[PDB]
Write a protein that binds this ligand. Structure first.
Ligand SMILES: [Zn+2]
Ligand SMILES: [Zn+2]
Ligand SMILES: [Zn+2]
Ligand SMILES: [Zn+2]
Ligand SMILES: [Zn+2]
Ligand SMILES: [Zn+2]
Ligand SMILES: [Zn+2]
Ligand SMILES: [Zn+2]
Lengths: 148, 148
C-alpha cells in the first residue's frame, strides 16, 4: 500500500481510501492548511483541499483584491464583477461605496465614484450601487438590460 | 416589440432586455413568486426565476422532505444525501439526531437510529452523525473511505 501523500508505504491500523488512492491519515490532509481530511474532500486534479481552502483558491475572486470569496460571504457587484464589502470603494478617493451611490465601472474592473469620473476618464459605464448580496459562487447568470 | 411575458407588445417608457427577449418590467418577474426581476435573473430553459426560487426549485433537495436547500442553510449529511436540521431524525422513533449519535443510513435515504436498526432491517450502513455544515449547493465531492 503506497501512500500517495508521502511515498512511504502504509503500515497503520487504519488506512484511508480517497481518489482511488491509499493514504496514511496524517497524509490525507489539505494541500494548503495541512489539516487532515475526513468523510469527503475536494480536488483540483492531483491535489486535495479542505472546503475553505478550495473556495479561497478556486472560488470567485474579488475583482479588486483578487482573493477567493466563499459562497458564505456577502458581496457587492458591478455587472459580472464581484467585490468584498471593504473593497467596493472608489479607486481614486478610496471612499467605500454605499447603496444608491452613483459610480462608474471602468473597463478593467476599477470603480470610480461619480465625482471623480471626469478625473479617471482623462487617465466608463455609470451605475448605482446595489445592495449587498450573498455571493453565488459562480452561478451562470443572465443580465437584465434597460432601453428607453 | 413583443413582450415575451404577456404577449401584448410593449409601449412603455422603459423596455427590459433579457434572454435576448423584450419585456414590460411588470412581466419580467419570477415565474414562481411573481416578483419583478432587476439587474440579473436565472433561467432554466424558458422560464425566469428570482434567486431564492431558483435554488428552491433546482437546488439540492432535502432527502427526507424533498424541498430545495439554498447554499445559505446549514444541513446534516449522510454519504451523498443532505438533510435539513429538523429532518435528520430517526424515521422509526422520530427523534432528531445529534452529533455523535450512532445511526444507520438505509438504501433509500431513510435514517434509523442504532436502537431501532434491528427493527428497520426486518422491514443498512452504520454511521456516526457528523456536525452540521453549510450546504455546498451541489459541489462535486470526493469520498474518504476507511479500511482497517
Ligand atoms: Zn503517508
Ligand atoms: Zn485547508
Ligand atoms: Zn477584495
Ligand atoms: Zn472617489
Ligand atoms: Zn408584458
Ligand atoms: Zn421568485
Ligand atoms: Zn427536509
Ligand atoms: Zn429511532
Amino acid at each position: 500500500p503506497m501512500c500517495a501523500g508521502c511515498d512511504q508505504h502504509i503500515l497503520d491500523r487504519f488506512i484511508l481510501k480517497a481518489l482511488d488512492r491509499h493514504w496514511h491519515s496524517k497524509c490525507l490532509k489539505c494541500s494548503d492548511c495541512h489539516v487532515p481530511l475526513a468523510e469527503r474532500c475536494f480536488s483540483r486534479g492531483e491535489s486535495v483541499y479542505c472546503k475553505d481552502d478550495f473556495f479561497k483558491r478556486f472560488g470567485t475572486k474579488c475583482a479588486a483584491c483578487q482573493l477567493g470569496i466563499p459562497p458564505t460571504q456577502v458581496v457587492r457587484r458591478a455587472q459580472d464583477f464581484v467585490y468584498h464589502l471593504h473593497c467596493f470603494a472608489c479607486v481614486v478617493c478610496k471612499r467605500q461605496l454605499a447603496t444608491g451611490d452613483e459610480f462608474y465601472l471602468m473597463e478593467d474592473s476599477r470603480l470610480v465614484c461619480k465625482a471623480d469620473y471626469e478625473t479617471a476618464k482623462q487617465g466608463g459605464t455609470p451605475m448605482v450601487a446595489a445592495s449587498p448580496e450573498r455571493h453565488d459562487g459562480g452561478l451562470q447568470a443572465n443580465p437584465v438590460e434597460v432601453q428607453s
